Amino acid sequence: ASKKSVRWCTTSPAESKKCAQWQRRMKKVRGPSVTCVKKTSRFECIQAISTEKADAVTLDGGLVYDAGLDPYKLRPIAAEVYGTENQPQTHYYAVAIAKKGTNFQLNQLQGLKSCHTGLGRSAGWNIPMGLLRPFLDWTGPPEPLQKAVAKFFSASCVPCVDGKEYPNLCQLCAGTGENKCACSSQEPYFGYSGAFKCLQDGAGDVAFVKDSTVFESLPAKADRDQYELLCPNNTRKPVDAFQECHLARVPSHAVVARSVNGKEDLIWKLLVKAQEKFGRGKPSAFQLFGSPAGQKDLLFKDSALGLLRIPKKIDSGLYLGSNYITAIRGLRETAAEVELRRAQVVWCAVGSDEQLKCQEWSRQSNQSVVCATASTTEDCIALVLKGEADALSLDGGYIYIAGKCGLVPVLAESQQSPESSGLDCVHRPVKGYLAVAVVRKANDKITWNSLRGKKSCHTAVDRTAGWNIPMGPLFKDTDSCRFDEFFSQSCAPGSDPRSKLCALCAGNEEGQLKCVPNSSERLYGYTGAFRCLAENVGDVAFVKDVTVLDNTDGKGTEQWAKDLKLGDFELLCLNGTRKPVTEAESCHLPVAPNHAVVSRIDKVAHLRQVLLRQQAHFGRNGEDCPGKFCLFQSKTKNLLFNDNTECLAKLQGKTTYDEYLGPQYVTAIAKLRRCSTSPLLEACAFLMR
């Protein structure tokens, strides 16, 4: 029955027959135990695996999606690999090409001519018609999508579609006689290359193919320049920019297993060894990837050439991706459900209090804003990645992580600048404080190159300009994460009390907790970091440019911050040189960043207008904030937003995270980030295999 073995699920006697020898050639090389379970559809299999009847089965994207839904909750354990020894691939991008010159965008396709790889195919039919659902005027499932499309496009070529039922969908095809619109290579414009030729010849204005088609059809760059890609943000971009400009991403078929009591490891071990003996390119008379003459793709894809272990963090939604899931949703929901989702905004509250404030703003919003809630900030990003969440305001460290996972900044949290300010904050962009390295002019043997082994003064451990920024481009070159083996002695609150990072710190008026991460530690914060330097302790201090000229000119604190000028201190430029705190715009590390609202490039447009409205009513000058719930007033604890940001300000050029955080900041963080891993980060790095 349920021996110490993986029970694979079969959906046809043939498939069931390959699993027969599959099991036996196994005991012969003492690889793991594999018993088969005869079923009659992957779907039956999904039910089996979920009720311990079986343990594994390999499914395709659409089924991986239904397998992961709330009743079964299976998850992808392994991905098939395609391509070849030199170029292995685990996924590709569905794209939309069109001749350069024409100027329609993705949202302006009504009435044009279309070329499709084939009815039912993924890149040529389901993904682009699922996404363009909002423009179809189609009831839903019962009505033939094919009639909705016949009315959307003037004419097209869709192989496999019914000629005398929907003539204009076969109008542009080129097969002759009884082969026009055929569902095979008999129809010239069939498949990827075919749908593409259909664009080249001029029969259509758009072709729905995948990332590589142009490159396989036009080896000459000169030729390829004549083409453009229609991006999901209604913009056009060159053909080798499919990475940042595609409709969707379709992952390789996957082996699924249950979440709870999945038997994963045992399942992978069986796969690891079987790949080793009967894999691709092995002597074996029986091969995992390959089927007899008639049958095809038994258990696995004949074309497959291996399996990759999928990181545990990834579930069915992360594996599929938001664009893919939306395309699926768009092909099975009602014009109602689709419109509701497209219109409302789901915020991802983090924590209980933040969930509460969100529910509240939900009421006052009249449902314009709705709430999803996670435990960590990372899970919130994951929810927005799989389309279950729409937005979330993040700090720079995470804006980056979301930037590496395909997310883009929507609105920035402009700083209120504390004690009063001025209106028109939606267009007046705050620059964010400049991180800098201040040094005493009474010190000539200490310049930003020659810092190794000097006395350093830090605000605190893991603080934007007090640590993360300097230690970043001051450790990028090397590949060690020993930030303690640099700087003889440093004061960095948040470090081991007895290490060299907590040697020069002060204490609680001397006597109590030393180096402790707070005001309870004299030389702490942009205040103590400047004190640590002012009082000849450290050769350098890392704080904000404003810390110097905002604590000097006999304007500081106690006895130390008196009688000390500004032209008395100095900055530390990456350019090796060094001038006064005045020219800090032309001599500084990077710019600390402001928190920003992050989301999917598809949701940006609609998200921006909804947030500016929420601001007009609940904003700092909102015609309803004092009167009824204030956006920027958290239960004093920075919920959903920072309690002292004036308004959400429009990004003015900066539209990516690279543009936003800045080249210098991305560099410091990057180095830093690869020292302290982010399971979600490696999850995203994997999805780009």
Using H for helix, E for strand and C for coil, what is the string for 552-584? CCCCCCCCCCCCCCCCCEECCCCCCCCCCHHHH
Task: Say if CB 284 and CB 297 are below 8 A apart.
Answer: no
Q: Is 643 annotated as a binding-site member?
A: no
Q: What are the start-end ranges of the H helices in 279-395?
A: 316-320, 322-329, 335-343, 352-365, 377-385
CA 665-528-644 angle, 5° bins = 60
Cα end-to-end distance, the chain, whole Å: 38
Q: Is 584 annotated as a binding-site member?
A: no
Q: From residue 655, give the alpha-carbon distance in Å to each of 160, 233, 596, 600, 604.
A: 41, 12, 11, 12, 10
Q: What are the start-end ranges of the H helices in 51-85?
A: 61-68
* Cα 629 to Cα 489: distance, rounded to the nearest angstrom: 49
Whose CA is closest to 649, among 487, 474, 432, 448? 432
| Beta-ladder partners of 540 | 456
Give helix 13-27 / helix 264-278 axis angle, nearest 10°: 80
Q: Which fold has domain 340-432+593-689?
A: D-Maltodextrin-Binding Protein; domain 2 (3.40.190)
Q: Is 496 annotated as a binding-site member?
A: no
* Cα 77 to Cα 62: distance, rounded to the nearest angstrom: 16
Task: Say if CB 679 and CB 687 are below 8 A apart.
Answer: no
* Cα 490 to Cα 505: distance, rounded to the nearest angstrom: 7
Q: Where are the domains of the chain?
A: 1-91+251-339, 92-250, 340-432+593-689, 433-592
* Cα 629 to Cα 631: distance, rounded to the nearest angstrom: 7
* Cα 274 to Cα 157: distance, rounded to the nearest angstrom: 43
* Cα 325 to Cα 341: distance, rounded to the nearest angstrom: 13
Q: Is 526 annotated as a binding-site member?
A: yes
Burial class (CB in 10 A: 0-12, 13-18, 19+), 27: exposed
* Cα 582 to Cα 574: distance, rounded to the nearest angstrom: 16
Q: Is 463 annotated as a binding-site member?
A: yes
Q: Is 466 annotated as a binding-site member?
A: yes
Judged by phi (left if over 0) then psi (alpha if -120 to 50, else beta), residue 212 lies in alpha
Instruction: Decide: helix, strand or coil at residue 550.
Output: coil
Q: How far is CA 276 from the centre of its chain?
A: 34
* Cα 417 to Cα 644: distance, rounded to the nearest angstrom: 8
- Give the chain's count of helices (H) and strands (E): 22, 24
Q: Is 592 annotated as a binding-site member?
A: no
Task: Say if CB 348 and CB 386 are below 8 A apart.
Answer: no
Task: Say if CB 188 and CB 117 are below 8 A apart.
Answer: no
Task: Say if CB 97 and CB 206 are below 8 A apart.
Answer: yes
* Cα 388 to Cα 379: distance, rounded to the nearest angstrom: 11
Burial profile 219-239: b = 16 or more Cβ within 10 angstroms, e = fewer: eeeeebeebbbbbbbeebeeb
Task: Say if CB 7 and CB 55 are below 8 A apart.
Answer: yes
Burial class (CB in 10 A: 0-12, 13-18, 19+), 574: middle
Task: Say if CB 458 and CB 424 are below 8 A apart.
Answer: no
Concerning whether 404 is annotated as a catalytic residue, the answer is no
| Beta-ladder partners of 494 | none
| Token pair listed for 601 | 């490039």
**Residue 460: which residues within 8 A CB-CB, separation 6 or more?**
466, 467, 492, 493, 494, 517, 524, 525
Q: Is 227 annotated as a binding-site member?
A: no
- Residue 339: which H helix or E strand, with range? helix 335-343
* Cα 172 to Cα 189: distance, rounded to the nearest angstrom: 9
**Residue 291: which residues within 8 A CB-CB, separation 6 or more?**
14, 18, 297, 298, 302
* Cα 259 to Cα 67: distance, rounded to the nearest angstrom: 11
| Token pair listed for 65 | 């999606």
* Residue carrying the six token digits 């310049």: 447
Task: Say if CB 394 and CB 661 are below 8 A apart.
Answer: no
| Token pair listed for 537 | 């302790």
CB atoms within 10 A of CB 91: 18
CB atoms within 10 A of CB 316: 25
Strands 74-80 and 254-258: antiparallel
Q: What are the start-end ranges of the H helices in 451-511?
A: none
CA 275-93-213 angle, 5° bins = 95
* Cα 455 to Cα 461: distance, rounded to the nearest angstrom: 16
CB atoms within 10 A of CB 518: 12
Type of residue numbered 592 = A
Got the DSSP string for 265-281?
HHHHHHHHHHHHHHSTT
| Beta-ladder partners of 237 | 229
Judged by phi (left if over 0) then psi (alpha if -120 to 50, else beta), residue 72 lies in alpha
Task: Output the CATH code of domain 433-592.
Answer: 3.40.190.10
Task: Say if CB 250 and CB 61 are below 8 A apart.
Answer: yes
* Cα 432 to Cα 446: distance, rounded to the nearest angstrom: 27
* Cα 117 to Cα 399: distance, rounded to the nearest angstrom: 37
| Beta-ladder partners of 350 | 374
Q: What is the largest CA-CA distance in the chain?
A: 97
**Residue 523: which residues within 8 A CB-CB, separation 6 or more?**
457, 491, 504, 505, 506, 529, 531, 532, 537
| Token pair listed for 260 | 């709870």
Whose CA is closest to 112, among 198, 29, 178, 176? 198
Burial class (CB in 10 A: 0-12, 13-18, 19+), 194: buried
* Residue carrying the six token digits 């005027």: 137
Whose CA is closest to 438, among 314, 572, 536? 572
| Token pair listed for 536 | 């000849």
* Cα 373 to Cα 5: distance, rounded to the nearest angstrom: 38
Helix %, strand %, coil % of the chain (to 5): 30, 20, 50
* Residue carrying the six token digits 């969707």: 248
How were these coordinates obtained? X-ray
Q: What are the start-end ranges of the H helices in 33-144?
A: 42-50, 61-68, 127-131
Q: Which of 17, 38, 53, 73 is catalytic?
A: 73
Q: Is CATH 2.40.50.100 what the domain over 1-91+251-339 is classified as, yes or no? A: no
Q: Is CATH 3.40.190.10 what the domain over 92-250 is classified as, yes or no? A: yes
* Cα 200 to Cα 109: distance, rounded to the nearest angstrom: 18
* Cα 380 to Cα 383: distance, rounded to the nearest angstrom: 5
Judged by phi (left if over 0) then psi (alpha if -120 to 50, else beta), residue 261 lies in left
* Phi, psi values for residue 436, rounded to 5°: -150, 160
- Residue 40: which H helix or E strand, with range? none
Q: Which of 259, 291, 421, 634 is catalytic?
A: 259
Strands 455-458 and 540-544: parallel
* Residue carrying the six token digits 């110490």: 4
Type of residue numbered 518 = N
Whose CA is closest to 439, among 502, 506, 532, 562? 532
* Residue carrying the six token digits 């004061």: 491
Do you know the residue count of the chain?
A: 689
What one-character DSSP code corresponds to residue 630?
A: -
| Token pair listed for 543 | 């704080």
Instruction: For 559-606, list the strands marked E by DSSP.
Output: 569-570, 596-599
Q: Is 606 annotated as a binding-site member?
A: no
Whose CA is closest to 271, among 79, 539, 424, 559? 79
Got the DSSP string for 151-189?
HHSSEEE-TTS-TTTSHHHHTT----GGGTT-SSTTSTT
| Token pair listed for 444 | 């000539």
Type of residue numbered 527 = T
Concerning whether 73 is annotated as a catalytic residue, the answer is yes
Whose CA is closest to 321, among 601, 47, 134? 601
Instruction: Decide: helix, strand or coil at residue 456.
Output: strand
Q: Is 123 annotated as a binding-site member?
A: yes
**Residue 141: which residues within 8 A CB-CB, separation 6 or more?**
332
Whose CA is closest to 257, among 303, 304, 309, 297? 309
| Token pair listed for 604 | 């940006």
| Token pair listed for 53 | 């009847």
* Cα 358 to Cα 448: distance, rounded to the nearest angstrom: 46
Whose CA is closest to 205, among 235, 228, 175? 228
Q: Is 117 annotated as a binding-site member?
A: yes
* Residue carrying the six token digits 């938001």: 322
* Cα 184 to Cα 189: distance, rounded to the nearest angstrom: 9
| Token pair listed for 277 | 């003996």
Task: Say if CB 321 and CB 335 are below 8 A apart.
Answer: no
Whose CA is closest to 326, among 484, 129, 173, 145? 129
Q: From residue 214, give the alpha-carbon distance in Å to each of 87, 189, 232, 287, 319.
A: 17, 15, 19, 34, 26
Sign of the C-alpha dihedral computed for residues 542, 547, 553 and 559 taken in this order: negative
Q: Is 506 annotated as a binding-site member?
A: no
